[PDB]
Write a protein that binds this ligand. Structure first.
Ligand SMILES: */C(=C\S(C)(=O)=O)[C@H](Cc1c[nH]c2ccccc12)NC(=O)[C@H](CC(C)C)NC(=O)[C@H](Cc1c[nH]c2ccccc12)NC(=O)CN1CCOCC1
Ligand SMILES: */C(=C\S(C)(=O)=O)[C@H](Cc1c[nH]c2ccccc12)NC(=O)[C@H](CC(C)C)NC(=O)[C@H](Cc1c[nH]c2ccccc12)NC(=O)CN1CCOCC1
Lengths: 256, 195, 221, 211, 211, 241, 215, 241
């Protein structure tokens, strides 16, 4: 891969009282051409781990296949739920991949978020793993997971990697990151987390040309990994001066 | 490359240059005479660089200074001469640069014996000893070491002999023919040295 | 740099940070980036500081000359025309991104001007390297017909976001409120950054500790 | 940058209680590593209350000094008064920007006294620093410029003390300059320090490293 | 950097400065540019410090194994050949190395200059680094094979001092070692060139010295 | 950016998106790309904002000069004396959401005595652009009404050529995506409502498919006697499939 | 028609080291940045190698992490094989070999190896990403090095001061390091947030924390 | 070049133009860009002819291998046992003008026992393209029928990414011009006649607007039991206005 051709825009992941909430719009752009409008940019690695990407779709798919086979081998060798790999383990794996490809100067044109639950003490989902049937889609309360038991990690093109209570890629790394550094707080409820993420996505939709308002939300919780029904974000302009007709401005000068 | 050397004492100024006129891989002359520009009133401009730029700039400066002295019926001061030369070189630097290094030596009653060092970028300053060319690297330390205040003309010439021997022995271009201009006792003398 | 502006009811509020940077080094910790063009017009600058200072001074004095000659109130549209024509003449080589705000017969007006000579009339805007963080704040919180106090708080929040999220922004927050009858320039407005550790006592060198070669004393008369 | 590295050089300016100080390195370089002079001063007096420290390309330093002397002399002969420090600072900014697209490779500082009349006259320390196209930083404690800017900034941030007499001001500025010069290959070979007081000027040459 | 070595009637005199730099910033003033390869061989290094140090350690390992196997001390010529062949194998990779190997073996005192380009020049007097030209001039103007130990040490010290004075890349301290039949001595462990300047060029300290 | 112009039975309708972006960042959310040169003459701008804006300022100055010189001496037209409405509120209505989205003004020069000609303004613009086509890079669509040729569309293309369009003109990056849609849906002598719907749909499709097109939609309807202007904010594209 | 990809980035940072009679200090700022943005405000730059040795690096974060992990793996393997912990000098030679192994694609990392040896003397090694130099008193790597090193020279060596001071102790040295890092934070855009200070002495390694400007 | 694929109620229809050009010269007037991988699997090629052709040859070899390995041992389906017509002559009729323009064949593997899967072939192609995306530059549309997912469309994009399309896929330089047209006209569960008309019109508009698209139009209709193929030569676009 010499460079990006078909690309996805920012991803946002945050911690809240019940786990991880990760959001991305379902759009992949072939330049300035929004060719694909229903693309999946968040993938499930196992019952406690998800991967989001921003950048080249081909490299993201390559990494997704690598992680899928890594999970299958882990499951083959598993004897107890403690044997399942953790989000930290997958983050280390992806960071090593990126570092080696940097050394070869054959990078993946991507920024990756690896998020999930770093513990096995909140459920028995990994006692019997189902890969081809999702029993989730029969409702019990969510479990309040400790912040220290959750994991969000970032990897970039040069192999730079770290973790935090919230991670952003793309233009989120400016807009959503400012909003999160201002307003994020610990143990947010699901509705509060969704409201914060929706504000960030609305600002991104208004100020980023490669984004859409068709949003995919994924929750990693004690119930496992849940994909929400994709929804259209309502995005209205915040000023009537935008809508004011141009013919009502003075006809002389550079009023535009 | 043309090696220029200059030494200023309390009672003299000595300028020295190699006497080679170079055109590609052959020496046109071993007794070149296009580097020294003697100017009435005990002034000397020693130039180093391409022969064409050397000739043009040296003659331009000499004719301008002679015009000044004829118009004003007076001798230009050495400091005025040096800074006039530097101002002209700086003026032409950003338009059509002369690629010449300058050693400006002179004597006047107001300031005594004066030596100024100027490079092709027109960076000038008065010095007690200076050098230009790739032989500067090999003669500057000799000048530093053997120079002292109250030096005499003959001791200065001995220092110059050391410099010439070093340029013959260690410099890639084995330079053996040098011309010296000596200003002292309100007279200017020419010498030719071979090592 | 983080500069920003917004239009509230009957006023225009401009804000700026106070850091000038020469590569990775802070050349000025308290530079003034808000400039008076006229009693009812101000601007905030981003880009090359020398270009910004020269251009703002030139615009201020040309506007004052025009005001003296016409004996009328200066116009934000006139400032926009002059600035854009100059910047276009130089083809973006005068790197000046300006938030120009003022109040005239047409009411409060805010313009964003870019180095190549384009302009846009906006309700709010932000420029500089912190412009994206400031814009995040402004997009989140802006609404029409805000009180002057609410607009001041919002401008402060935007500039603070820029200061604390952009490495090329820092220092204090300067604000200017421009109405049709007066301007209030608050410098500093926030002062959010200060050196946090100080030695127990300052290091005073004992007299004569520095060796000297010579000392010449001259008396000024 | 390399054009600044060609010669090197550094200037510093500090303020005290009713005094200022301006310091410079005395080296003249060539090809970034050859020392040709050890007495190339970078401080120039415009009038009794105005000094300019010019660092950068030596030819540009000399040219800018000649232009500034011309302008100041004309202004002063016309007005029959000494030029104000703020007026000189603004004039220097405008002169530097007049060559915006082919600039002088000089990074100057202005150090002096602002005179305020009430009977007696009040002398207020005045310091400004510039970039090569006239961007101006007005400061109350210290200004630096040259290839040693980072070292000087660190030393002045750590060691500057507000409201010092002339002796403490001289010690502080000289220590800052010497420590900053000790870490620069292309600056040094002697240091010149001027301490301005409303009634006298003290000029000192420091015993510095010559390597 | 300035490193020099020369043969004289009582052995070899080796001298170096102690300055390291990255660009125009002085990274250190107390590095050791003379190393002992074995008991009877000293190498003075110039250029890339990391390359010089690594390849000198490599040569030391090779010489140690050779001497252990063959129960004899290696010759300076053989060590220089090994080093030059190794360096030549890397020609075109960017190594920066100028090493003077001086030592005593069964054929007397020997001195070789080895480069990263695969050069190996046998000689009686060598100088390397950015101050090499100044050191060369000083050594050539006053060299003699019949100098006493004190005179030779003084000559080496003076040459290093002048190189540091004229070259911005050299400075710090001057070290002078003496190689003789039975090994080597450190006559000058390290001497600041500050005192050298104010003892050679400006003993009076009444004013700033004018170069 | 998407700018369109269409000629219907009784006038000419210009429409534009309102997104100005510096690459992928959106510098201006809602810019004004349809600009009035004269009461009966409008221009849609595409390409570099600085270039198009400065050109349009110069052309407005020129058109003022031309209108002043077009005035004749004396009095005229002493015995002579010179429909379906768009439901803009219904068009803009959104369930999940002092707003002004419609303006209308009548020409002061009723008989077109001194108003400059659309061809004249378009051609002076073309000459200006061609004399500096080594630097300037902008594409313009002049839509206007004059008593000689009635409603007119002129395309001033990149590099400074001029083509008069008798059906429709498109320009900008987003027009490519709607090229065949407009060709298929256009017909001669459309009614005002048909033209409004067609041009609105064209801009909506262009914004849906183009990352450089977005924001609201601005529409200007120039007729024999008046000019109407609308702003549309219900720009989302909803597909059944 | 594609642009080439550069495999190096600078993530900022400053690491200072200061030795004493029987102690060593290593301070590092924790900010991680990319161009004009902050990736995170807490990325430690110092890693513990042994009970008497630590290493702090500045440069590309991925290279720093990989190099510190590789050094730790080498030291653990050394302990397992030769049944004793290497001292700071052995670790210095080991790191030199590791660094020159990539001589033609160097690690983008400048590192200070701080420790105390068998004589209970503080030791510092400065690495320019390929080679090592033993530092007598103090050292600094990263973006603030040119601001900080003059200060530490003035406060420690005092070469340009006739009236010198010699009472150097752990508390005064810690205060000097805090002042140096704060002054660097004043003028360096890549230094800020928090700083971790490790003191190694006879009682082991102790870590304290100091707050810096967040702009 | 223009390649399109559409999914209608009972199958999948691929269509393509047939112009291969080296710049502005047309090297091949009527090339074959829809190619059979298996009886129930077809690929439309776009981009460099050499790259796409060699890739398709490799993939055909791979698909032969896969089909051979898919065969199980024994006998099966002992007791088991396994239409609007396009008026192609009328479609092609031209007043001013032994020609074969229609073919149809039934699958030999009636029950899809050993035929490879559309996703399998598309993904092996994607892997091959991605392993050499530093050199290869082609875009492919796989249209096929398998008994697991029925009719399928897969887009293998430049740089080697794979997206399954459930409504339609387009590619080539000419698809941009018909983007909004196809989006507007497409609907779910179209009849064969509706899909044929839509895809033919899409290719015609793309050829009208794109200089790199021309020649005749090739259409392949893949259903559960058979494959039909049509050639259309009445490609001229006639506008009333
Ligand atoms: C905002 C930052 S940004 C990244 O958005 O460009 C600030 C805006 C700013 C700073 N100061 C003022 C004053 C008035 C109005 C606005 C102001 N811009 C900057 O700080 C500049 C950013 C760079 C990338 C252009 N920095 C500068 O222009 C430097 C200022 C400077 C340098 N040394 C100094 C000493 C004293 C006083 C000021 C300074 N200058 C340069 O970078 C010099 N270059 C030389 C080549 O030509 C361009 C300017
Ligand atoms: C002589 C100078 S010269 C001009 O003749 O090359 C010295 C010789 C020298 C210096 N140090 C030692 C140690 C042992 C033996 C010999 C020595 N050469 C230099 O100083 C080098 C000159 C450059 C132009 C090749 N400089 C260096 O090699 C740098 C040393 C260094 C860097 N950081 C330090 C901190 C503390 C102490 C020393 C150093 N290193 C580099 O320039 C390598 N760069 C560093 C930046 O990233 C890229 C690699």
């Amino acid at each position: 891969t010499l460079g990006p051709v078909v690309t996805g825009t920012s991803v946002i992941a945050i911690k809240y009282k019940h786990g991880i909430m990760i959001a991305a719009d379902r759009k992949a752009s072939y330049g300035s051409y929004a060719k694909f409008q229903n693309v999946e940019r968040i993938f499930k690695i196992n019952n406690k781990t998800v991967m989001g990407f921003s950048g080249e779709l081909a490299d993201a798919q390559y990494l997704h296949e690598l992680l899928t086979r890594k999970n299958i081998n882990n499951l083959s060798e598993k004897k107890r739920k403690e044997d399942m790999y953790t989000p930290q383990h997958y983050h280390s794996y992806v960071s090593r991949v990126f570092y080696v490809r940097k050394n070869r100067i054959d990078p993946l044109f991507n920024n990756i978020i690896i998020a999930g639950i770093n513990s096995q003490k909140y459920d028995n989902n990994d006692d019997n793993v189902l890969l081809y049937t999702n029993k989730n889609n029969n409702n019990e309360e969510y479990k309040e997971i400790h912040k220290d038991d959750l994991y969000i990690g970032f990897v970039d093109m040069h192999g730079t990697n770290f973790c935090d209570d919230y991670i952003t890629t793309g233009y989120a790394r400016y807009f959503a990151l400012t909003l999160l550094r201002d307003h994020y707080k610990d143990n947010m409820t699901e509705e509060e987390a969704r409201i914060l993420i929706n504000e960030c996505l609305r600002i991104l939709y208004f100020r980023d040309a490669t984004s859409s308002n068709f949003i995919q939300i994924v929750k990693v919780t004690s119930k496992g990994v849940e994909y929400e029904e994709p929804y259209i974000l309502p995005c209205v302009l915040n000023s009537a001066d935008y809508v004011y007709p141009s013919t009502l401005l003075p006809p002389a000068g550079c009023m535009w | 490359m043309d090696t220029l050397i200059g030494l200023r004492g309390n009672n003299f100024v000595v300028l020295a240059a190699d006497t080679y006129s170079i055109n590609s891989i052959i020496k046109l002359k071993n007794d070149d005479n296009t580097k020294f520009y003697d100017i009435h009133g005990n002034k000397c401009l020693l130039l180093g660089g391409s022969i064409g730029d050397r000739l043009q700039f040296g003659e331009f400066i000499r004719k301008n200074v002679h015009l000044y002295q004829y118009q004003n019926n007076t001798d230009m001061f050495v400091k005025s001469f040096a800074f006039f030369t530097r101002k002209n070189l700086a003026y032409y630097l950003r338009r059509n640069p002369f690629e010449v290094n300058c050693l400006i030596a002179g004597y006047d009653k107001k300031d005594g014996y004066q030596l100024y060092w100027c490079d092709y970028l027109s960076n000038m300053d008065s010095v007690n000893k200076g050098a230009h060319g790739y032989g500067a690297y090999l003669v500057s330390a000799i000048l530093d070491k053997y120079y002292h205040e109250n030096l005499t003309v003959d001791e200065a010439l001995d220092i110059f002999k050391l410099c010439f021997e070093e340029l013959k022995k260690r410099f890639l271009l084995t330079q053996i023919n040098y011309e010296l201009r000596i200003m002292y006792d309100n007279k200017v003398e020419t010498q030719y040295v071979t090592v | 740099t983080t500069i920003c502006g917004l239009v509230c009811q009957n006023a225009v509020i401009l804000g700026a940070d106070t850091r000038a940077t020469e590569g990775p080094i802070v050349a000025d910790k308290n530079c003034s980036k808000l400039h008076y063009i006229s009693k009812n017009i101000w601007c905030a600058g981003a880009g090359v500081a020398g270009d910004l200072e020269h251009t703002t001074l030139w615009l201020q004095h040309n506007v004052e000359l025009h005001r003296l000659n016409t004996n009328t109130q200066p116009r934000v549209s006139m400032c926009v025309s002059r600035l854009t024509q100059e910047l276009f003449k130089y083809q973006g080589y005068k790197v000046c991104a300006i938030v120009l705000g003022g109040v005239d017969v047409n009411g409060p007006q805010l313009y964003g001007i870019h180095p190549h000579g384009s302009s846009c009339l906006l309700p709010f805007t932000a420029l500089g390297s912190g412009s994206l963080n400031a814009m995040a704040v402004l997009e989140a919180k802006y609404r029409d017909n805000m009180t002057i106090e609410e607009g001041k708080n919002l401008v402060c929040e935007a500039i603070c976001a820029g200061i604390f999220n952009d490495l090329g922004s820092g220092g204090n927050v300067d604000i200017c409120v421009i109405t049709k009858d007066s301007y209030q320039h608050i410098r500093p407005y926030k002062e959010p950054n200060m050196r946090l550790y100080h030695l127990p006592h300052p290091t005073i060198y004992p007299k004569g500790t520095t060796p000297i070669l010579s000392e010449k004393i001259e008396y000024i008369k | 940058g390399s054009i600044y590295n060609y010669n090197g050089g550094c200037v510093l300016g500090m303020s005290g209680s009713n005094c200022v100080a301006i310091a410079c390195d005395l080296r003249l370089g060539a090809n970034t590593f050859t020392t040709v002079s050890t007495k190339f001063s970078k401080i120039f007096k415009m009038n009794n209350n105005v000094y300019v420290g010019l660092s950068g390309l030596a030819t540009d330093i000399q040219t800018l000094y000649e232009i500034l002397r011309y302008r100041v002399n004309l202004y002063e002969v016309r007005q029959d008064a000494e030029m104000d420090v703020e007026c000189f600072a603004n004039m220097l900014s405008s002169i530097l920007y007049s060559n915006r697209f082919s600039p002088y490779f000089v990074n100057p500082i202005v150090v002096g006294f602002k005179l305020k009349h009430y009977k007696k006259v009040n002398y207020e320390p005045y310091l400004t620093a510039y970039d090569l196209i006239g961007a101006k930083c007005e400061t109350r404690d210290f200004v630096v410029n040259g290839v040693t800017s980072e070292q000087l900034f660190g030393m002045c941030e750590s060691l500057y003390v507000k409201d010092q007499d002339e002796n403490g001001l001289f010690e502080t500025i000289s220590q800052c300059l010497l420590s900053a010069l000790d870490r620069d290959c292309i600056s040094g070979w002697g240091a010149e320090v001027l301490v301005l007081t409303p009634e006298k000027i003290i000029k000192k040459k420091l015993k510095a490293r010559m390597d | 950097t300035t490193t020099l070595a020369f043969k004289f009637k009582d052995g070899i005199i080796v001298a170096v400065d102690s300055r390291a730099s990255m660009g125009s910033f002085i990274s250190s003033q107390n590095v050791e540019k003379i190393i002992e390869i074995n008991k009877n061989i000293l190498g003075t290094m110039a250029g890339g410090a990391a390359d010089c140090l690594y390849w000198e350690k490599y040569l030391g390992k090779i010489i140690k194994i050779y001497e252990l196997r063959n129960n004899e001390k290696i010759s300076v010529r053989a060590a220089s050949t090994i080093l030059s062949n190794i360096l030549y194998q890397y020609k075109g990779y960017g190594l920066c190395c100028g090493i003077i190997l001086s030592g005593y073996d069964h054929t007397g005192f020997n001195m070789f200059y080895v480069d990263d380009s695969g050069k190996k020049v046998e000689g009686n007097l060598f100088s390397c680094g950015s101050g090499s030209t100044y050191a060369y001039s000083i050594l050539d103007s006053a060299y003699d094979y019949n100098l006493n130990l004190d005179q030779a040490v003084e000559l080496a010290r003076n040459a290093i001092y002048h190189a540091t004075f004229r070259d911005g890349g050299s400075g710090g301290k001057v070290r002078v070692f003496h190689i003789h039949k039975n090994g080597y001595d450190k006559i000058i462990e390290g001497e600041d060139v500050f005192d050298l300047h104010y003892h050679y060029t400006n003993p009076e300290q009444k004013d700033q010295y004018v170069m | 950016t998407t700018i369109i112009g269409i000629i219907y039975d009784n006038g000419v309708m210009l429409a534009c998106d309102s997104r100005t972006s510096s690459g992928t960042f959106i510098s201006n959310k809602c810019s004004r790309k349809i600009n009035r040169i004269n009461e009966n003459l409008y221009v849609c701008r595409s390409g570099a904002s600085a270039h198009s804006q400065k050109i349009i300022e110069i052309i407005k100055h020129y058109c003022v000069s031309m209108k002043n010189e077009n005035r004749k001496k004396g009095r005229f037209h002493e015995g002579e004396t010179i429909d379906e409405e768009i439901d803009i509120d219904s068009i803009n209505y959104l369930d999940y959401n002092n707003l002004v989205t419609k303006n209308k003004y009548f020409y002061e020069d009723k008989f077109n005595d001194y108003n400059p000609l659309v061809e004249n303004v378009a051609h002076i613009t073309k000459k200006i652009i061609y004399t500096n086509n080594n630097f300037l890079s902008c594409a313009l669509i002049f839509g206007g009404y004059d008593k000689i040729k009635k409603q007119q569309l002129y395309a001033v293309n990149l590099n400074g050529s001029i083509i008069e369009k008798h059906d429709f003109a498109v320009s900008g990056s987003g027009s490519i995506y709607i090229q065949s849609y407009l060709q298929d849906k256009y017909k001669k002598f459309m009614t005002k409502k048909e033209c409004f719907n067609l041009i609105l749909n064209c801009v909506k499709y262009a914004m849906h498919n183009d990352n450089s097109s977005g924001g609201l939609i601005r529409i200007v309807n120039i007729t024999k006697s008046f000019v109407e202007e609308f702003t549309v904010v219900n720009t989302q594209m909803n597909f059944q499939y | 028609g594609f642009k080439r990809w550069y495999p190096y980035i600078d993530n900022g940072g400053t690491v200072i080291g200061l030795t004493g009679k029987d102690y060593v200090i290593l301070a590092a700022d924790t900010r991680l940045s990319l161009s004009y943005s902050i990736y995170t405000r807490f990325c430690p730059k110092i890693s513990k190698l042994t009970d008497k040795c630590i290493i702090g690096s500045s440069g590309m974060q991925s290279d720093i992490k990989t190099l510190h992990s590789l050094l730790q793996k080498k030291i653990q393997l050394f302990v397992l094989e030769h049944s004793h912990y290497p001292d700071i000098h052995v670790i210095d030679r080991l790191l030199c070999v590791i660094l020159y192994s990539r001589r033609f694609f160097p690690y983008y990392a400048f590192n200070i190896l701080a420790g105390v040896d068998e004589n209970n003397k503080g030791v510092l090694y400065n690495y320019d990403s390929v080679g090592s130099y033993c530092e007598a008193t103090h050292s600094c790597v990263g973006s603030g090095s040119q601001l900080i090193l003059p200060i530490l020279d003035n406060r420690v060596e005092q070469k340009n001061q006739l009236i010198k001071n010699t009472n150097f102790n752990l508390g005064d040295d810690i205060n000097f390091v805090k002042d140096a890092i704060t002054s660097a934070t004043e003028r360096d855009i890549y230094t800020g947030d928090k700083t971790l200070i490790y003191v190694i002495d006879k009682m082991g390694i102790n870590v304290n924390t100091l707050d810096l400007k967040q702009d």
